[PDB]
Amino acid sequence: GRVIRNQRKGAGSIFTSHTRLRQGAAKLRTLDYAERHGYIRGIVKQIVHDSGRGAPLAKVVFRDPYKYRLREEIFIANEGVHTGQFIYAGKKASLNVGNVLPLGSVPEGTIVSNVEEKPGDRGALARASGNYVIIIGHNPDENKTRVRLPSGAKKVISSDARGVIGVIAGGGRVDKPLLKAGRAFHKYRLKRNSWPKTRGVAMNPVDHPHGGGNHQHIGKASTISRGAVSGQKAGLIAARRTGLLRGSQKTQ
Amino acid sequence: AKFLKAGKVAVVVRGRYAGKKVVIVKPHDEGSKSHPFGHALVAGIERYPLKVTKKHGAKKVAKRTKIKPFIKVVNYNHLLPTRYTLDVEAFKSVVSTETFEQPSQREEAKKVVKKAFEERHQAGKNQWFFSKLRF
C-alpha cells in the first residue's frame, strides 16, 4: 500500500493553518495583583471581524498599573457589547454582560463564556459563536465549581478560574444553507486545506482500506478498535453504537 | 437667577484659547451692528504659571511664576459658565468696546490685566483660576 491521506496531515506541509489576515490570539488579560484583589477598568476601542472565525473580536484597551502606558487586548465579543463601553475586569466586579469575573463570585444559573480550565491559562471553554457554560451549584469546600459545558458534559473546575459574562456573538450561523460549492470553497480558503473531500470507497486499494472491488463497497465492518494503528483507522472509531438515533436525545 | 454677569468665571470651549479660564467683563446681550449675536468681552490668561516647589527659591520661583494674559470678544455659545466667582473692579474701566478696533490700544490693557493676575497668584487667591484644566 501507499500512505493514506489522513496519515499525511501530521507532517503539515500543505495542511497548515492559513493565517495571514488574522487579528491575533484571543486570550484574556494576564492574572495579576489588580484582578485577584479589587478590579480594573478598560474601554472597548473597536469590535471587528476575524478571518476563519464565526464570532467577532473586541480590541479592549487597559492602562498599565506599574508604568505609564496603555495595554491592548483581544477579547471574544459577547452578544451585547458596544464600542465605548467600559469593561470592568477582576474579582470585585458586578454581574454585568461583558465583565470578567471569577467563577466563585458569580451565583448559580449564571451564563458565562471564554472560561479558563485551570486559573491563569487565559481562555479555554466556550469560544465559538453562540456558546456558553451554565454554572450549576457551587462547593464551599476545596473551592471547586461544578459547571455544564456546551456538549452536555458536566465538569468540576477551580473557583478561581475566570469567565466573561453572557453568550458569544454570531449565534445561528449554521442555519442558513450554503447552497453552492463556491461558498464552501471560500469558507475553507481562510482556514486549512481540507476541502473538497474524496470518498475512500472510490479509490484503488493502495490508497485506502476501503479501496478496490468490482462494486463500490466497504467490504468489512466500518467500526474500528480504539487500539488499531496509523493506517487502519478509517471509518467509525471506537463506536459504542451506530445507526439513526431513536428515543430521547442529549445528555441527562 | 441670570448667571452671565460682570463678576463670573468661565471656560473657553473653542478657538486658540480653547480649554482656558476667563472672566466675562462686559456682557453685550441683545445684539449689535458688528458682532450681530449674543457676545461678551473676556479677560483671561494664556500661559499658566508652573508648579513651584520647596526645592526652588528666589530666582527660579520668579521665572516659574509669570502669567502672559489675553483679552477677547467671545460668543456665549463658546463658553462654559461656572459657579466660581472672580472680582472685576481691578480692570472695569480699562477694557471696553472702544479699546478694541485699535492695534496699539490693546497692549495698555494687557499690561494692566497682567498686573491684576500676577498680584492675585502671589499669596493664594483664586487657585482654581491659576491651574490648568487637564484634557
Binding site: 495583583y33 484583589h37 479589587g38 498599573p65 | 513651584v52 497668584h121
Partner: peptide
C-alpha cells in the same frame, strides 16, 4: 505655605502609577 499645594496621589488599584518599591525578593537571578 505661600504658592505650592498639597494634592495627594492614591496608590490603590486602577488609579495612580505605582511607585518604585524595593523588589529584591522577586529577582530572577
Amino acid at each position: 505655605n505661600p504658592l505650592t499645594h498639597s494634592t495627594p496621589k492614591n496608590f490603590g488599584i486602577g488609579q495612580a502609577v505605582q511607585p518604585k518599591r524595593n523588589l529584591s525578593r522577586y529577582v530572577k537571578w
